[PDB]
């Protein structure tokens, strides 16, 4: 069923809450035993948001390999993503260790450091060129190279140096700065423009490691970003674009990380973003 007609059907009958609860009921339940070990309590922001064991990213260290991060591997679309929580004061070094070890080119951030009067993630990158950051627990140095502030997003160029080997790499930081404190955006236009800027940079392409994407918990706004990107790519690849079923794509992604898409409003907004984005994919 053409999702555009499915959309109007759900909208007129006002059944978004019902559709969303059906997804919650059918979603996968896999173990997350490593996340729940006592030694990892201060590595998790939220007690009820954990990576599954089978898809969790492992740090390359013998001490403690745990980070709250998951590999989402989309086989038909030929895209992979790492979805993670916003870094905590005690996990900023682990976060950049992961970026290095996984050979990522881009980091996508969908939250502000403070929202609703409370801290949603650590200030984990430098704000001035001349004030670099050193992460002594993981032996990395991080420098701000340039910053481009736009009305709806900011793009930063960063240098990450492995201090053990003195290799360096350029990392791109794509920061969507205008998601509202409550609810979802009225129009998907600025979010789609942002997605296309991430695509244009190479950060999602197979010559690099998976993009790292986060918000506060790494499941809501972050799920919206990867769901929209994968659905648009599938409509480009298939003979019949109307065969792309957003609910089936979402359930496939939920095999790899729990809780993706946190509200019925985020589900509706994901539909709207794919519907409006297709009017470029299909040749306009």
- Radius of gyration, whole Å: 19 Å
Q: How would a crystallographer describe the biggest sheet?
A: 9 strands, mixed
Q: What is the number of beta strands?
A: 11
**Count of distinct structural domains:** 1
**Largest sheet: spatial strand order:** 1-2-3-11-4-10-9-8-7
Task: Give the topology string: H per helix, E per strand.
Answer: HHEEEHEEEEEEEHEHHH
What overall geometry do the principal axes of the alpha carbons give? Answer: globular
Q: Report the sheet-strand fraction.
A: 15-25%
The N- to C-terminal Cα distance equals 22 Å
Q: Roughly how much helix do the residues carry, as a percent range?
A: 25-40%
Total count of helical runs of at least 4 residues: 7
Secondary-structure-based class equals alpha/beta
Descriptive terms for the model:
9-stranded mixed sheet; monomer; 284 residues; phosphoprotein; 30% helix; zinc ion binding; 7 helices; alpha/beta
Describe the model.
This protein is an alpha/beta fold. It has one domain (1-284). It has helices at 3-12, 16-26, 92-101, 189-200, 221-237, 246-253, 264-281, and strands spanning 56-58, 66-74, 79-84, 106-109, 114-115, 118-119, 133-135, 140-149, 153-162, 168-176, 211-214. Strands 1-2-3-11-4-10-9-8-7 form a nine-stranded mixed β-sheet, with helices on both faces. A two-stranded antiparallel ribbon has the order 5-6. A hairpin with a 7-residue loop joins strand 1 (56-58) and strand 2 (66-74). Helix 2 crosses helix 7. The chain is globular. The relative contact order is 0.17. It is classed as hydrolase. Keywords: PanDDA, Diamond I04-1 fragment screening, protein tyrosine phosphatase, PTP, protein tyrosine phosphatase 1B, PTP1B, enzyme, allostery, multiconformer, hydrolase. It forms a monomeric assembly. PanDDA analysis group deposition of ground-state model of PTP1B, using pre-clustering, cluster16.
């Amino acid at each position: 069923m053409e999702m555009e007609k499915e959309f109007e059907q759900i909208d007129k009958s006002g059944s978004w809450a019902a559709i969303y609860q059906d997804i919650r009921h059918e979603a996968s339940d896999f173990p997350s035993r490593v996340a729940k070990l006592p030694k990892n309590k201060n590595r998790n922001r939220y007690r009820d948001v954990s990576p599954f064991d089978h898809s969790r990213i492992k740090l390359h260290q013998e001490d403690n390999d745990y980070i709250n991060a998951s590999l989402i591997k989309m086989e038909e679309a030929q895209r992979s993503y790492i979805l993670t929580q916003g870094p905590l004061p005690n996990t900023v070094g682990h976060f950049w260790e992961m970026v290095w070890e996984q050979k990522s080119r881009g980091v996508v951030m969908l939250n502000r450091v403070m929202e609703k009067g409370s801290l949603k993630c650590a200030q984990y990158w430098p704000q001035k060129e001349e004030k670099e950051m050193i992460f002594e627990d993981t032996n990395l140095k991080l420098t701000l190279i340039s910053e481009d502030i736009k009305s709806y997003y900011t793009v930063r160029q960063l240098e990450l140096e492995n201090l053990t080997t003195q290799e360096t790499r350029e990392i791109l930081h794509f920061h969507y700065t205008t998601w509202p404190d409550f609810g979802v955006p009225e129009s998907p236009a600025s979010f789609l423009n942002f997605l296309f800027k991430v695509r244009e940079s190479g950060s999602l392409s197979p010559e690099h490691g998976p993009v790292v994407v986060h918000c506060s918990a790494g499941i809501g706004r972050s799920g919206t970003f990867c769901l929209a990107d994968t659905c648009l790519l599938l409509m480009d690849k298939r003979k019949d674009p109307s065969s792309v079923d957003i609910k089936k794509v979402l359930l496939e992604m939920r095999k790899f990380r729990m809780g993706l898409i946190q509200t019925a409003d985020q589900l509706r907004f994901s539909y709207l973003a794919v519907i409006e984005g297709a009017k470029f994919i299909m040749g306009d």
